[PDB]
Amino acid sequence: NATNVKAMKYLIEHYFDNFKVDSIEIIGSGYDAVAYLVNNEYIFKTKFSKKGYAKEKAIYNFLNTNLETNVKIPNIEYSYISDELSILGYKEIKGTFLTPEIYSTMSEEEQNLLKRDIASFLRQMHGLDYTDISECTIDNKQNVLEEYILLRETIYNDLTDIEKDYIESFMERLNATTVFEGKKCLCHNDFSCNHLLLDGNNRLTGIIDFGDSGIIDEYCDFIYLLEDSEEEIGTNFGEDILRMYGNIDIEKAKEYQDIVEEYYPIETIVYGIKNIKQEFIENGRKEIYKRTYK
Ligand SMILES: Nc1nc2c(ncn2[C@@H]2O[C@H](COP(=O)(O)OP(=O)(O)NP(=O)(O)O)[C@@H](O)[C@H]2O)c(=O)[nH]1
Numbered sequence: 001n002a003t004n005v006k007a008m009k010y011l012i013e014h015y016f017d018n019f020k021v022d023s024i025e026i027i028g029s030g031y032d033a034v035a036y037l038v039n040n041e042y043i044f045k046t047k048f049s050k051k052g053y054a055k056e057k058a059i060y061n062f063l064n065t066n067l068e069t070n071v072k073i074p075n076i077e078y079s080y081i082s083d084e085l086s087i088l089g090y091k092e093i094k095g096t097f098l099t100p101e102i103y104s105t106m107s108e109e110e111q112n113l114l115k116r117d118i119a120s121f122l123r124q125m126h127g128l129d130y131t132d133i134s135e136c137t138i139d140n141k142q143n144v145l146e147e148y149i150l151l152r153e154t155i156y157n158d159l160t161d162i163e164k165d166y167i168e169s170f171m172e173r174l175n176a177t178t179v180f181e182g183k184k185c186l187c188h189n190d191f192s193c194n195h196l197l198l199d200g201n202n203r204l205t206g207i208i209d210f211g212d213s214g215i216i217d218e219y220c221d222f223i224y225l226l227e228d229s230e231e232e233i234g235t236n237f238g239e240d241i242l243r244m245y246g247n248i249d250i251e252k253a254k255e256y257q258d259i260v261e262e263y264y265p266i267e268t269i270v271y272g273i274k275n276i277k278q279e280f281i282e283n284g285r286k287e288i289y290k291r292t293y294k
Pocket residue numbers: 027028029030033034035043045074091092093094095194208209210211
């Protein structure tokens with residue numbers, strides 16, 4: 001922990017010539033990556049990995065050049081990208097992350113203005129000509145098909161009948177659906193309320209973590225806004241945002257979300273196979289049983 005910070009302080013000062021670290025603390029952390037707050041002013045995201053930060057950096061650059069908006073996003077001042085190590089540094093966007101608790105304290109009018117701000121942001125981003133980042137495409141259906149092939153080549157035959165049926169029933173739905181055939185555009189693609197920042201009037205002031213962004217189905221950016229869970233605000237919130245956003249089939253957006261949710265245990269298994277992490281394989285398989293029995 002105090003050791004973790006030291007290594008990273010060392011790396012930051014080694015790769016960024018005149019940068020002096022006076023303070024550094026961990027502010028966020030997954031199984032792939034760690035984020036640090038440095039000098040109480042800079043966020044540094046770091047990853048020991050093509051699975052690095054080149055695309056994410058290209059997207060910040062494209063967005064900072066082409067969006068016209070008052071909503072802040074990361075603006076990369078420092079970067080180091082190699083095969084084994086990636087670092088992005090940018091000034092911290094100040095604010096309070098949106099949560100369900102906070103939303104519930106807001107007045108009706110505050111909630112509306114927040115929704116309108118979100119809809120506006122998404123409309124502007126989805127309307128950009130993405131020619132200049134055209135290499136950042138993501139085909140979710142094809143990705144799933146390839147992940148299924150990887151399953152068939154590795155552990156599929158050791159799975160139980162219940163697990164196999166869950167997977168085959170998902171593949172059948174994937175084959176019948178039309179929700180991947182609509183408009184493609186640049187999406188944030190991890191658009192949950194823990195990535196939305198509010199200012200002191202409860203208005204949207206910033207958006208972070210475009211680390212999964214790319215050119216993908218328009219429906220992608222409504223997946224968490226439509227989610228019913230403890231972490232997200234609720235389906236009505238997403239529905240209202242969709243009405244404000246306009247010119248989009250809401251029932252398809254919901255079908256897209258439902259499909260991505262059904263995929264989740266399989267995505268988890270596949271993550272464990274690819275990263276040689278048995279814990280994830282086991283968790284995904286257990287989750288299939290939990291869903292089958294509800
Ligand atoms: N206030 C503030 N916090 C930030 C900012 N950038 C990152 N953070 C904090 O650092 C955490 C990690 O940043 P994030 O980009 O989401 O990292 P990640 O590796 O992509 N995590 P994940 O993909 O799992 O959401 C965020 O959850 C948030 O707590 C920022 O500009 N402002």
